[PDB]
Design a protein around this ligand. Structure first.
Ligand SMILES: Nc1ncnc2c1ncn2[C@@H]1O[C@H](CSCC[C@H](N)C(=O)O)[C@@H](O)[C@H]1O
Ligand SMILES: Nc1ncnc2c1ncn2[C@@H]1O[C@H](CSCC[C@H](N)C(=O)O)[C@@H](O)[C@H]1O
Ligand code: NA
Ligand code: NA
Lengths: 332, 332
């Protein structure tokens, strides 16, 4: 395989994103979950032009997403099973999210690199979370995508740290709270507080009650730039600080330090950037955080610098059976 | 390597397109072609913010495109060498092309599949070639990208067909003419006519001179929906009909039919679609043709239909060592 074909496949990655977006957004996987279906039925049920849908499905089937079981009849595959709606490991929200506003923001990453102006803010006229707070459907998609990402790695975080000492667990910017839920499931003596923006914390609470897992979890709606809940034994910032530049991260951390009792601990759960040139998903997420939020992933030394500015000291960086690390800090 | 990670890497293909686009557009490969350079110097020369450019470069370095030779110093790799400007195998124009209007048009592929409305025309308010004729920088990029792709497959076409019987070879919509040039190189006694829009035919002369065939190859500007040049021994349509719907393709073919002499041959060089589920670049290019042009790749049976409507009969479909096939037809 010539180098030119390797590079061409890289350059054309956007085709894959959008072709999978089409299949995800139309909900094809749900329609073929029981048995393969003819193209005309799939088109009719999804509101697509049959010959055009056929072309999209043939193309992604060639990389293992759906399969043409007989001419004009399409079935599910292992990769397409992840695009079903409402299943425990669904990645449908992720496929949807990456084909919409985030795709468009990324059209201007060059301008962002040249000027420092956050690409999403240029494209849509306000901050990422400010935008989502105005658009409930996009908000739902983001929160479900984010929760699906974290749900899949939560077990690895729980296997990597002893949570026994903590009876009150405060998750700051918890989203829909899959990691908090996993911690509570594993520690039957613990109670949790799921802290987020009011609209997110309200929806998270209903999701917990629905799933019947909110007995020892309460929700609090607030603003971590103003204050966070007091008296927790551990404060968890999971996939949170990489949303914020240094100035804003320091603000969050100082509010955590204010609220925390002196016996409390701080846990940062994130894709800590390694040394060297090996492949790492966090190197790519780092650029996504640039485009959307004007933020970044960080090295251990960068966290140390944030901690010194916020009244914390790094205790240790614990690895996990995922890309994530736990950065443990103590109040000083 | 969990399935969920495989699918996430597919969904995030757009990040790769855009990150390579930044490095290509800024011209980093030319800056480091002869020796590695520190990020400060790269930032200064390109008008980029150093910390942000460093992040992009270290991310693409982790997939083999550039290398961090020491901290904050970057050098070339074989994949990044393909992003240099003006080199014989340059893919710089392809990387630029795919990150700009074509990327933005692909944001609307769902709507195109739902409604049949061409995504590029929705996004830009005009046809693809109409846009390019008014945007010189994008036009040069397109034409150089297209010629670079075709150059890498031209030997496979010439190897698959004996061009020795033809005294005059006419290439309809030839662009900058790399296939025509390969044909003429292979047959020193042959004369060529390159036909394209006036602005393209005008620019092609310089490329034909560089290719060493300029002394034997005329450049004719015009519109193939009106007329094409008469009396050629063979008329070549290479990566041409896939730009046009059936009706417009028939218009082109009928003009070729009335220009052609009775002993003439028609050769269509295209990514003819196969029936199975194997990987095939033409499956992806077929979607690209939808998005940009409201067009398609075709099967042999589809070409027979067009030929019946335009006074031609299929003679043979010849395979090549590339994805391309040669559809040979005769006037009836
Ligand atoms: N000012 C603010 N106050 C509280 N929460 C905020 C906030 N600004 C953003 N957030 C929340 O920060 C979260 C970032 S996403 C991280 C979600 C989750 N902790 C996980 O591990 O996946 C979102 O749920 C968002 O609503
Ligand atoms: N109406 C028209 N008349 C003449 N050429 C046209 C045209 N509309 C589009 N084209 C040309 O059709 C070409 C399509 S791209 C194919 C280029 C080349 N044959 C190759 O093998 O790569 C472009 O060069 C474009 O300028
Ligand atoms: Na296709
Ligand atoms: Na762009």
């Amino acid at each position: 395989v010539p180098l030119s074909s390797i590079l061409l496949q890289m350059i054309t990655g956007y085709w894959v994103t959008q072709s999978l977006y089409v299949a995800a957004k139309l909900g094809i996987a749900d329609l073929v979950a029981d048995a393969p279906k003819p193209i005309e039925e799939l088109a009719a049920k999804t509101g697509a032009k049959a010959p055009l849908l056929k072309r999209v499905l043939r193309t992604i089937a060639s990389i293992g997403v759906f399969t043409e079981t007989e001419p004009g009849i399409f079935g599910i595959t292992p990769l397409a099973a992840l695009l079903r709606s409402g299943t425990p490991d669904s990645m449908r929200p992720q496929a949807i999210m990456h084909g919409e506003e985030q795709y468009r923001a990324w059209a201007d990453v060059l301008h962002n690199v040249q000027t420092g102006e956050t690409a999403f803010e240029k494209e849509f006229g306000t901050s990422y979370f400010g935008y989502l707070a105005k658009h409930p459907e996009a908000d739902r998609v983001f929160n479900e995508a984010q929760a699906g990402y974290t749900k899949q790695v939560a077990h690895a975080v729980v296997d990597a740290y002893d949570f026994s000492p903590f009876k009150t667990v405060i998750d700051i910017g918890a989203g829909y709270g899959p990691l908090l839920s996993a911690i509570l499931r594993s520690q039957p003596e613990a109670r949790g507080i799921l802290f987020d923006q009011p609209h997110v914390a309200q929806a998270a609470g209903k999701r917990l009650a629905e799933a019947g897992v909110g007995d020892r979890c309460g929700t609090v709606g607030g603003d971590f730039f103003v204050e966070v809940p007091a008296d927790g034994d551990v404060y968890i910032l999971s996939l949170l600080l990489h949303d914020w530049d240094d100035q804003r991260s320091i603000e969050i951390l100082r509010n955590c330090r204010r609220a925390m009792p002196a016996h409390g601990k701080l846990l940062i759960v994130e894709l800590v950037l390694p040394e060297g040139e090996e492949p790492f998903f966090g190197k790519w997420l780092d650029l996504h955080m640039l485009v959307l939020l004007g933020a970044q992933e960080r090295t251990a030394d960068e966290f140390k610098t944030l901690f010194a500015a916020s009244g914390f000291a790094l205790e240790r960086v614990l690895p996990t059976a995922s890309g994530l690390s736990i950065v443990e800090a103590r109040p000083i």
